[PDB]
Amino acid sequence: KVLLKVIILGDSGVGKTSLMNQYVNKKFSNQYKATIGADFLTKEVMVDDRLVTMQIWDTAGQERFQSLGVAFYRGADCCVLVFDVTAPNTFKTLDSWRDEFLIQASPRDPENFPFVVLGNKIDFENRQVATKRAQAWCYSKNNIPYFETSAKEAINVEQAFQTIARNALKQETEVEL
């Protein structure tokens, strides 16, 4: 019985909120309800012989909803990085999201911290960002795992979150100290 904090970072419009309500509640909606502030949802899951409670913190990509020195980050056990395959700008921002996270949570051993990158929205056909340069990018950065997901049609949502889970748990375990 173990608690995992998991934070979902990335630009506004990538579908951070939609991946959440899909994974947790198996529901999808077209209605873009801009995420004000930062809340969470819990999903209970089984990872490797162990019941895990995953607290999933969904944040506001916009700077329209920033207050104001967000230290909700720390105690994080896995940071999830979401870009939109139809928008090259949301992929370019990933380092900046990754840097910002590491400043804020500043976990010890920062470069073994579990990141997961989700190429959301592959249910569309106008993908701009190939699988190949995002596969590269996740590899350039300590070989972090990468899925191409769709919250709408629910492709790789479950699979990806099994990895989010398992990696969150390894990291939690690493607090032997």
Ligand SMILES: Nc1nc2c(ncn2[C@@H]2O[C@H](COP(=O)(O)OP(=O)(O)NP(=O)(O)O)[C@@H](O)[C@H]2O)c(=O)[nH]1
């Ligand atoms: N076709 C399709 N639309 C998606 C997908 N994921 C999200 N959307 C749509 O994209 C828009 C933005 O989604 P949203 O979840 O709000 O993204 P967000 O990153 O959480 N935005 P915010 O940071 O402002 O909450 C919404 O219209 C949403 O329904 C997807 O996989 N496929």
Ligand SMILES: [Mg+2]
């Ligand atoms: Mg959101």
